[PDB]
Design a protein around this ligand. Structure first.
Ligand SMILES: *[C@@H]1O[C@H](CO)[C@@H](O)[C@H](O)[C@H]1NC(C)=O
Ligand SMILES: *[C@@H]1O[C@H](CO)[C@@H](O)[C@H](O)[C@H]1NC(C)=O
Ligand SMILES: *[C@@H]1O[C@H](CO)[C@@H](O)[C@H](O)[C@H]1NC(C)=O
Ligand SMILES: *[C@@H]1O[C@H](CO)[C@@H](O)[C@H](O)[C@H]1NC(C)=O
Lengths: 541, 535
């Protein structure tokens, strides 16, 4: 039970030991506050510094999670596959919901060590940071993995568009946890000048929105964005006042005055606000990051094109097939999806995503022709793989390449990768590969610790080898900034020895094809990526 | 030896010229056999008729005169074959005795009934002759009777006004007359009037397909081989015949408002006055050519095949790798292909003078620019030639060939498809180009089996001789029974040619490494046939 004196008092951890023999013991400080709780009048206000406590504080038990409703109407497509499949197992973690969230979990192993802050969340109104045990990652890579809880949903992202409720309260909590780390990690042994930030899904969009901000000026140095970006359709909210008024009407006080409505919402209880069941438009979000002027000044799209950011390092990537939830109705059919429904599915994809009345018949017919296999036009079974790739390319792959190019034009080291592996789960078909959010088990060393309630995968030796490689690639980035130099790719127990990860250049757009058969490719779907970035903007507008 | 064969109109005497090879037997050549009454006078601009019988024995030993033409004028460069345009001076020695007393017929009888393979020459509709191709090697190797003819070309055989004064299609009516003459007299020479194959290239194939879509040639021939040509191209038929007829007439001597008066005066002028008048059509279009009138081609070459109105002949279509080699001609002597600033210039010009639709060309121009790009190698520059060349090959030749093959197979009829992939090593041709337009003609006629000629000065290696024997076997086998695989055994040994079905679009990859592929340019072909009409 080591005691480490911080700048706000003293805490006490534990010395829990991992189940492996090649991993040393770690010291865990679970439940370290980093902001005064927004229990009362602090709701819909930015966080502040914590209050110092006398004596020594218990830090052993996992902290309570921010209020959320895991059995409501959450956006299903945004969530990772393992979150939706194992919903009952994931609901056990979020049981002690309370507004006294905003705690911090530290996993210190046993020069100053690096720090790796993890921004959780598949959507903007679900999840908690207790699901990810970073003890294995911290011990293997000799880094200090830290996971946090931040306000979610209405409580942390409600905005009206005016000064009454600016919004982005969840983003300010993430910045506050970075400021706390920049001032208190030296005692635990970390280095405040080598702070790495990483996430996945909606957390990855928070990483990119944190980069294009002035509040996070000199807090962290590097960044990782796994299967996420800040220019997707479901990244930022462009209709904040509309969804607030629907919420205000449902609770009971839809006052005309913006200030009056906000004050009433502060009077109501937390559970009443969370369980209101407000549903947004398809492929969008209801409550999320809102452009206000402080955190996100004007627009994520405009911000990167104007070159206004502090030039951080980056490590972007995507998976093979992430639109696995785009094709779900035709998932138990003997032979794929029929041509009657392929046209209807593609047609619906355009109204609720483009919907432009300035010429749509040409746009609808152009993408029907391109996402086809004219050499095997009447296959039928592979129309699923084509429809799955239509959603993956448009929503994930194309924005990731556009972000990598914009971050590499202004000189900044950028590393691109594609994940081509998954574990044989229970309820997933054998034709899909590397669904959304499937890189998390390997980056956190799940196969090296065994099966988990969230991951019922039966990991073989090949899955163990891949995890020891992904963690090595990720950790080397946090140590020096290049996934190759500080640590070699040795078995320590293999085609990973001879491969060198090269930078992503705007004209030589190389990447690393992570998998069981790695290879440094040259261009990821250059035909389909260029279709969405070059041709499509010339069709509707 | 000078054998004599009696026909229905008289007697003719041939020659027994022996070939330069040992594995080929001697052939008998009846050069200059008439098949229509010579239309010198008022018979101009009128359909032909049967010849007049000649008493005694007629001599058929020397090659006949060619129809009037202007081979040193402003001919369509793109339409003509590559071997014709390069050796324009060597090809002009054949067309020297130009006279209106053309419409003769050349026969090459080898040494029970043998098939007949009538060859329809022509790269454009106003040039060429039947003497350029010596079908002695093809006749001796395949044991068939090869026939080459001369028909009226250009103004004298295709001038039309759209009225009854001059219907047009006079050149087409002459080709049918040769078939009618062959179907009525080839029995004496030893041929089989029930197995008459017709084949051609370039503008010969365009009038092969037009002969299928007609009622005049109902029970005359049986099969058809179309090499690099269709009836649905831009330069296949003429849709504005009156505009060019008025342009020609006003240039020569006449601007009479009445159509009949203009036709009568044109008959008064000499043949050389009309031919050498230098009338130029629009780009990728023809000035004097086949025109829809109602007698030969009733309604439209596109409409007729869509309604399934023909007599269900066997067919054999094909194309080459790159035939638009003349499309990329100005930027042919540059260090690094074509510049990206000149790529969208030729594509915009291609859309400008070929579609020209005021219903929105901005979307069409950007779509075909993006389709024909190599984003994996966006900055190659030299490779941009291979995509500009392939843009013209796909639009003009490959897409109509596949559309014609499908439409002739939906209505039950055998169709065979091929793609040529070999060429002769010339002197003025670039090393990267492959199988330009008309580069399959030397192989089908067995030129390498006899040696390089004036028209084809390429140095033919041992592979070219091997390929020519195979190509002449497939063509001969088709003309014998209709199946290029069965009658005569032949990596060509184990290769079998499969029919072209509309859903199983198999073809043959003729070349040094034969294969039976499944979909030729499926992505690009389906772009022109399906997406473009929606744009
Ligand atoms: C820390 O936790 C232990 C629980 O075993 C408790 O006994 C102890 O009093 C705590 N120390 C504090 C609150 O300072
Ligand atoms: C994992 O293995 C156990 C024991 O063999 C089995 O019961 C279970 O179904 C397996 N699960 C998967 C996803 O393969
Ligand atoms: C016919 O041709 C033969 C062979 O060339 C020749 O000997 C004969 O004189 C010719 N007859 C006439 C009338 O020209
Ligand atoms: C033709 O090619 C052969 C084979 O390489 C060579 O021996 C011969 O000299 C060549 N002749 C000419 C005229 O190029």
């Amino acid at each position: 039970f080591p005691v480490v004196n911080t700048a706000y008092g003293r805490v006490r951890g534990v010395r829990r030991e991992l189940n492996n023999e090649i991993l040393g013991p770690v010291v865990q400080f679970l439940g370290v506050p980093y902001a005064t709780p927004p229990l009362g009048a602090r709701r819909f206000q930015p966080p502040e510094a914590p209050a110092s406590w006398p004596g020594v504080r218990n830090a052993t038990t996992l902290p309570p999670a921010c209020p959320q409703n895991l059995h409501g109407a959450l956006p299903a497509i945004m969530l990772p596959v393992w979150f939706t499949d194992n919903l009952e197992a994931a609901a056990t973690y979020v049981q002690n919901q309370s507004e006294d969230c905003l705690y911090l979990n530290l996993y210190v192993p046993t020069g100053k060590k690096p720090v790796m802050l993890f921004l959780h969340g598949g959507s903007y109104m679900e999840g908690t940071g207790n699901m990810f045990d970073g003890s294995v990652l911290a011990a293997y890579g000799n880094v200090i993995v830290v996971t946090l809880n931040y306000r979610l949903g209405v409580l942390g992202f409600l905005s009206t568009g005016d000064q009454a409720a600016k919004g982005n309260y969840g983003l300010l909590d993430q910045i506050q946890a970075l400021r706390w780390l920049s001032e208190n990690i030296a005692h635990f042994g970390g280095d405040p000048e080598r702070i790495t930030i990483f996430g996945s899904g909606a957390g990855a969009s928070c990483v990119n929105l944190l980069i294009l901000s002035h509040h996070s000026e000199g807090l962290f140095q590097k960044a990782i964005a796994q299967s996420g970006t800040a220019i997707s359709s479901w990244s930022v909210n462009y209709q904040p006042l509309k969804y607030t008024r629907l919420l205000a009407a449902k609770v009971g006080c839809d006052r005309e005055d913006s200030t009056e409505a906000v004050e009433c919402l502060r009077r109501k209880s937390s559970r009443e606000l969370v369980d209101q069941d407000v549903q947004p438009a398809r492929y969008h979000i209801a409550f999320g990051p809102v452009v206000d002027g402080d955190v996100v000044p004007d627009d994520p799209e405009i911000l990167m094109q104007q070159g206004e950011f502090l030039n951080y390092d980056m490590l972007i990537g995507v998976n093979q097939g992430e639109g696995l939830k785009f094709v779900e109705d035709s998932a138990e059919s003997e032979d794929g999806v029929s041509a009657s429904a392929f046209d209807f599915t593609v047609s619906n994809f355009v109204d609720n995503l483009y919907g432009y009345p300035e010429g749509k018949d040409v746009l609808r017919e152009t993408i029907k022709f391109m996402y086809t296999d004219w050499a095997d036009r009447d296959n039928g079974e592979m129309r699923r793989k084509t429809l799955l790739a239509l959603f993956t390319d448009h929503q994930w792959v194309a924005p990731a390449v556009a972000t990598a190019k914009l971050h590499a034009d202004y000189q900044s080291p950028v590393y691109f990768y594609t994940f081509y592996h998954h574990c044989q789960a229970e309820g997933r078909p054998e034709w899909a590969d590397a669904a959304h959010g499937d890189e998390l088990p390997y980056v956190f060393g799940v196969p090296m610790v065994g099966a988990t309630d969230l991951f019922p995968c039966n990991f073989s030796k090949n899955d163990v080898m891949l995890s020891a490689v992904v963690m090595t690639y990720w950790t080397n980035f946090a140590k020096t900034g290049d996934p190759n130099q500080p640590v070699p790719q040795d078995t320590k127990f293999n085609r990973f020895e001879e491969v060198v990860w090269s930078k992503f250049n705007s004209k030589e757009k190389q990447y690393l094809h992570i998998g069981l058969k790695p290879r440094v490719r040259d261009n990821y779907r250059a035909n389909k990526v260029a279709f969405w970035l070059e041709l499509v903007p010339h069709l509707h507008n």
